[PDB]
């Protein structure tokens, strides 16, 4: 519309703004003052129609976002780069007989040692710039400015948790879709059939069986067997919310919950699995709209002409931009009746959060300091534990 209001014309006069004094190397020095009227507009009180509108409160809403897999996180010393692991293969006890060659007492019997070698993690970073002169214009107390400087920092702590939780639930779906053997994969037909298969596959763990681990794709576990058991204190179902609302809605969940394990807290579920994307073709960055889209989510370091390798992850919705279409797929389970029952010790996850406040660079030209947050996180998944995937594929 259009407004011929005496106060709205004063409001919309942008040549008087504070931004004019900070986007020009020479600017206005002394203030004459302004006539402020609250008549026949908003901000109008019944008494004293000539005062400036005043703030009752300003409220920093700071939500503590949590990583649900944080109790799995071991902490290492960030030294070397290859973590390896190994088991001892089964040798079943044999009957003894007193009528043998009796120089087989001299014979040897070594253990057999299935292993697997893991690479490194990656170091991740994020920064935030806080200045000292222009952000003071909009808090009216020192306490609100310090709460702002602290809320920015705790948001930078919280989105690390969001990143790591979304990253690990992308790992556990990428694993089961692509890398997992089709011996651990059971196939369902309908939702009640899948519920009965999930509830019999929980009970297919806690059993001394060499059938449910992928020790055959360890380095030395191709011949022989390796028997794994799993308690119920370390079994986790990873599924969707539309299917957790059906698994918990059965009488078997009630008899698990009564006098026993908390079955609500062993079923880790999400809305539908995957907001994380993968790169399949090594592309480059060509357009400024994609650069600004990456700047919106805090990715400051990437510029035009940067190449993205095959297998890089993004952790937000990227596939709508012109040069990402086709080059980028999604870690999303096919035929969303989906449940992946694992032992929680299979997630080999360790970090290094020792010294993640690197000391600030001041930049006293603009008086805008910068704090960086560096952390090393190693995400892997071990083959020596019971895993079952129940899909319709």
């Amino acid at each position: 519309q259009s407004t011929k209001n005496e106060t709205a014309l004063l409001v919309a006069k942008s040549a008087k703004s504070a931004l004019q004094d900070f986007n020009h190397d020479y600017s206005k020095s002394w203030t004459f003052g302004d006539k402020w009227d609250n008549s026949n507009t908003m901000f109008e009180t019944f008494v004293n129609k000539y005062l400036f509108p005043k703030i009752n409160e300003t409220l920093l809403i700071d939500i503590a976002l949590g990583n649900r897999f944080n109790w799995l996180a071991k902490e290492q010393d960030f030294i070397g780069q290859y973590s390896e692991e190994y088991v001892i293969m089964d040798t079943v006890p044999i009957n003894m007989d007193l009528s043998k060659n009796e120089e087989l007492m001299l014979k040897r019997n070594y253990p057999r040692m299935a292993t697997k070698l893991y690479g490194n993690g990656i170091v991740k970073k994020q920064k935030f710039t806080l200045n000292n002169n222009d952000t003071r214009f909009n808090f009216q107390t020192l306490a609100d400015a310090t709460n702002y400087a602290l809320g920015v920092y705790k948001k930078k702590i919280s989105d690390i948790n969001v990143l790591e939780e979304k990253e690990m639930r992308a790992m556990l779906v990428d694993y089961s879709l692509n890398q997992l053997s089709e011996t651990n994969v059971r196939k369902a037909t309908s939702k009640e059939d899948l519920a009965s298969k999930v509830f019999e596959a929980i009970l297919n763990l806690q059993n001394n069986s060499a059938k449910y681990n992928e020790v055959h794709r360890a380095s030395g576990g191709a011949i022989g067997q390796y028997t794994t058991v799993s308690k119920l204190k370390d079994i986790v179902i990873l599924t969707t919310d539309s299917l957790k609302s059906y698994l918990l809605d059965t009488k078997i969940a009630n008899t698990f919950q009564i006098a026993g394990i908390d079955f609500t807290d062993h079923v880790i579920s999400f809305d539908d699995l995957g907001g994380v994307f993968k790169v399949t073709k090594e592309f480059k960055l060509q357009n400024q709209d994609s650069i600004d889209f990456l700047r919106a989510y805090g990715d400051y370091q990437s510029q035009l002409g940067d190449t993205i390798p095959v297998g890089a992850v993004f952790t937000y919705d990227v596939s709508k931009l012109k040069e990402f279409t086709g080059n980028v797929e999604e870690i999303k389970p096919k035929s969303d009746l989906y449940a992946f029952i694992l032992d929680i010790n299979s997630i080999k996850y360790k970090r290094y959060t020792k010294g993640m406040l690197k000391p600030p660079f001041h930049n006293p030209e603009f008086d805008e300091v910068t704090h960086w947050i560096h952390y090393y996180s190693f995400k892997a998944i071990s083959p020596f534990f019971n895993k079952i995937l129940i899909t319709d594929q």
């Binding site: 944080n70 010393d77 790591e164 020792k354 010294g355 406040l357």
Partner: peptide, 27 residues
């Protein structure tokens, strides 16, 4: 093992690793 002047400026203390104080929020 050999120290000489081992605890020198910021990097010689940065490998003698520093201040596990802030960890991530859940546990």
């Amino acid at each position: 093992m050999y120290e000489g002047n081992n605890m020198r400026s910021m990097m010689g203390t940065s490998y003698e690793d520093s201040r596990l104080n802030k960890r991530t929020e859940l546990n």
